[PDB]
Amino acid sequence: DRQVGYFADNGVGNPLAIVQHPAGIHKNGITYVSYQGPKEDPYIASYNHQTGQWQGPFRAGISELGRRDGGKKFDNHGKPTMLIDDEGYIHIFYGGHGGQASNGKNPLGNTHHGANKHAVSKRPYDISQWEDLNNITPFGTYNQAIKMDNGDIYLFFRHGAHRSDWVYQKSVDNGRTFASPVSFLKHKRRTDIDAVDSWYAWAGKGQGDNIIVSYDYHVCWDGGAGVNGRGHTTERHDVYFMSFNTKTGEWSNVEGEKLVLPVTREVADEKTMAMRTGELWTFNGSTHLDAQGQPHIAINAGIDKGAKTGGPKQTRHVRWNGNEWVGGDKVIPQYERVSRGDFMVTDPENIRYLTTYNQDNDAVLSWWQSHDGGEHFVEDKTVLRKDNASFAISAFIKDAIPDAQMLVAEKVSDEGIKMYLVGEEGAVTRSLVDLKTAMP
Template sequence: MRRQKPNAYPVVRGIKSEQKKMVVILILLILAPTILIVPVKPLQGISNEMNVEYPRDSNLNGYQTAFGENWLSGWSYRKSYTIEKTLGAGINYTIPIVVYSGIGADTGNTVYLNSESRMDLGDVRFTGEDGEELLSFWLEDYIRSYSSDYFADDCKYFSVSPNHYPHAYYYNGRTYVVWHGEGENDDDAGNPFIRYYDHSTRYWSTSVQIGTNQLLDDFHGSPNVWVDDEGYIHSLFGSHAGLIPLQHAKSNEPESISDGFTITELDWRATYPSVFYDSSNDVTHLWYRYYNGAGQFDWRYVNSSDNGITWNTQHIFIDVDDGTGYIPYRYGSTGLDPYSKDRIHMSWSVYDEADPHEYENVYYAYLNLIDMHAYNVEGIDLGTTIDVNEMQNYCLVLDTNNHGACAGSVHTDSKGIPYIMFASEYNDGSGHQYFTYWNSSSSSWVTPEQVCNVNRYSSVPDFIVYDSNNITAFLTQGEDLTRWTWDGSNWMKVEIIKSATSSRDVSFGFPVAPYGTYPQEDLQITFCEWYNAYDNKAFAWGSQGIVSDYSLQGAIFWVRLSGNLSENSQTIYIYYGNQAASSTSNGFETFPLFDDFNRPSSTIVDGTWTEDEGNGILSIEMNQLKIIQEQNEYCHIEQSSPLQSTLVLRGKMKSGDNTGVNWSPALAIYWNSYDWIKIGMNDYAGEFMTLMNVDSVILSNSSGGALSGSWYYYRIRVGIDVVCAEYSTDGLNWNLLTQISRPVVWIGYPSLIILGKGYAEDSDTFPGSNLDNSLSTPGFLGSHYIDDVFVRKYVDSDPVYGYWGGDENPNITQYSDTYIAGFRETLPDDIMFRPDDETYGEGYVESFTDISDWTVHTGNPLTSDGDVGRNNPIFFNHGRSIYRGSIPWQPVFPPWNHMGIQI
């Protein structure tokens, strides 16, 4: 099929006579009668005799060129990339490549994939020059455009009281969240909405309305969510006390919220429905409070073995038919035992029917899914139903003596020991968050420990049990949502997750850990603000902080070259355009030293590291290295440095309060006890800080602006002659903190890489090796995190990035032309044509004086007169972009894939 040509003709300028114009026309007619000269527009200040032309289809016979036979199977596109020869770089040099998924100008080490890749860039691969040898790479982080720190801003104020807050469920790399919202129409209906968080891309989907809530302005109609073993998404909503049937929504397609939901009615008088899905046995357990229409309430459950199509007969779990007036109400985070999978644990409070807004007492029991009997904490069989007397005699954890209490959450450790956190006024009439657990040695619940104050005792907490000595809790303290940790003996406040503002009466609370796989480190809880209006916001939090709403732009990749960069320039390919591919990012294969700490939480860091923790605690938590230690005490991990005299140490760190100064947590390169350099931050003055020991002489540099609880990138570059320490907020733009000439005593290989806290000044005062020294005044305890640490080879000037080739596609024929020697000399004047990439309707001929800084597709720089040798076909990729230095020629209309430059 013939490609359509632009409907325009070039405007020729700078030709001095009609005779010269005729010469140009005759030459073009004789030498290239079917060449189409397309419209151009000018570039200023450049001149040489170059003629840019496009071949018509009728002139392509005999000029087609194919790519080499090697092509990575399954991929649709690639671009070539050349890295210039660099003395000292050697083999296995690792380079950063910044990859954007959209359209832009390829320059330096930045490339755009023209919207042909997967959104998450999981299909990106790198090969050597042969196009098939896969190179090791690591995707360090995504580049995002910030939108907001909340995932919903339309939560009905009545839907964020306990039992009605946003719920979440994790399944197959996504966390689905649901809430009672208004949507764009602001119709005050309180309908159920859903969106999901993709853990691989850290990207929030758009929000979708699940259905119509017939209960309207009533918090009892708030939705929940779960996902069955086939990937179908379910939600229950819209019922209370028999007024309206419970609505069951099921997604029309697996793992899809955009293809709609089918709604069916469950004719039960169900309030506060909670679902616990047993994926191991494909059984759905539905729990709810039941109203019989005659003033009696009880707690019931039903089961389904066909993903909610049919349900078995309702069964009473707590029966209050004896007329005591007790109503089981504020039940906590009940759920499947994450270890044994054969129990559903629950805690609850009750209220007196005569005063339905005063909740009291804390209770606990579990349902054994093997015999479907209820048991108390001591294992006493309570039969299939618990009556009020059994509840009081066997299930009571705490009698609050008519003071308010709100049973929050119950979770177990690997031994089945239950832990409960709740808010109550029972002790002194003021609200506090409390913690208790079952002591099997004394066969009793330990006296509840008061953790912190809370303004509303109905602000229920939630928590995650890693083991009996490692618990993370999320508590409303005052009006703030805070994070605390338990070491088996004491609670310690780690950080404020979200602070209440003074601009309105708002507090943050109601944290809930998502159900499903337990737990997901990067999204551990959802929570919301409590504000008596219709614009409450809902948030999520994980190991990297608030899970903000971003649009995904690109990513930072590190690629290990296979050739010897000291001897030759290296050409590699970036492949993309394979929707079925998933990322093969692997830092351990990319760097000589690497650790992303992505492994199960444990008090053992890893066998490759030596732990020098002193009296502190080193652990893996939330896929990060966690350091708990007092201000002036050492606590770190270390391992032998790669055998490289020039190197870069790089990583991320989040320092909490009480860092100390000289002992502040840091990344350190260590030659010996009194020759080392480290970089981090201290909270004493909110400073980024470099400390150096040069033959027992301490040097330091600092800069303000560092915030406790924030993640920063740090790196130390050790070159042949210069050592630099830098910090960054995004890993792309760096701030120089320290630059010194490399001391003679730092020549040679470093002996250790050290991560954490430690210090040494001289042998008299600090005799400990490997920075294992402490002060006699240890200071206060603090918690700090380190992540994504690597060491790479380095030369004082990193390799020069050459040029990018254009999009290549094995299914699209690429064209070229060969030109006749001497054609350049026959031109009457210096001219160049350039396509007009905006209107396509105007064209120009422009004079050029010097194009020595242009680089063409073959990689050969042009001489000042534009000469690259006669009879050489030179090609730019015309389908995308061309460059002069950093100035791009933007993409033009793509009917012609290449333009040839006649010389």
């Protein structure tokens, strides 16, 4: 036998992403991890830090996205999001790319394919057996699950495909029933151009009973519209910020001004804009508060080189300094390829990213540290590096301990992808004999 750096070897497509979060959660000495496996089904494993033992992976549900007739080989939008409820049941939200006509008429958006789904463990703290609840709307993409101190559960998602509101559904009974969706970002026709307001959001815990949300704007062009008939692209710009007080129900901007829901583009431009990106095209990141309660934002942006996706985008750091939004500098200086990363912040000046980028054809995952509030970062330890590969990463694990902070997928082909749990220094290893016995 020997120890290997990966805990599973069956990921497909992009098995992880920062937007589907948490992908993993630490509780009581156990780190639970989830990722997208064969047929885009959600798989879950766990590591016991005291005994050194891995369990799983086990399949938690059956995704429609892996059973489509034709189309893109892998969809990836239904990779899993995890939550542990106050009774210890593990919930997995997965499978959705906006629903389809067979599910109904979507009253808050359009559709695409794949009903959004919700599985729960049959027993508390036991990842081996699952049951379906599917008690959330099927018209969902981009699940983000948050549990408050009182046990209430909020699931944030886009209520359909592009031309859809962003919503949450709230449960007060440990995820067994959910109230109807509440729209917090509005989609609607623009009156000045042939496009629809569309959004991408990342919701996370704030302090106290607050949830914080960073988001970018998608110019969702009608077919044949735009410059020289360019038509529909992934064009996105800018980054915005707002907060949700879950006790009162009210939303506000960084200065505490209250917002009427759902927030429109016009209100957002007036009240919640955090950093304009000019002509740069964006891909949203994440947001976290510093020790003074001030929001910091990771936003990816890059030059539009004429592709349907614009061009490669690099992570940049933005923060509220107490009086104004500042920043926008790239985390990796002078880097012009693709970078992604999540960050931790303590004092407002002290920010650390765990970021992936490529050097030549090698995939790198390394820590980058700033002590000047994100104007300059310096690379510190590399936690994982693989030749002839690229990495997909999760957001930081909920309540992570130093040994197990982020999930990484070593993309080489689009199947058989090795999955890694990494900490401050490197991977949490697994016995190869154990892994082979466990792999389904």
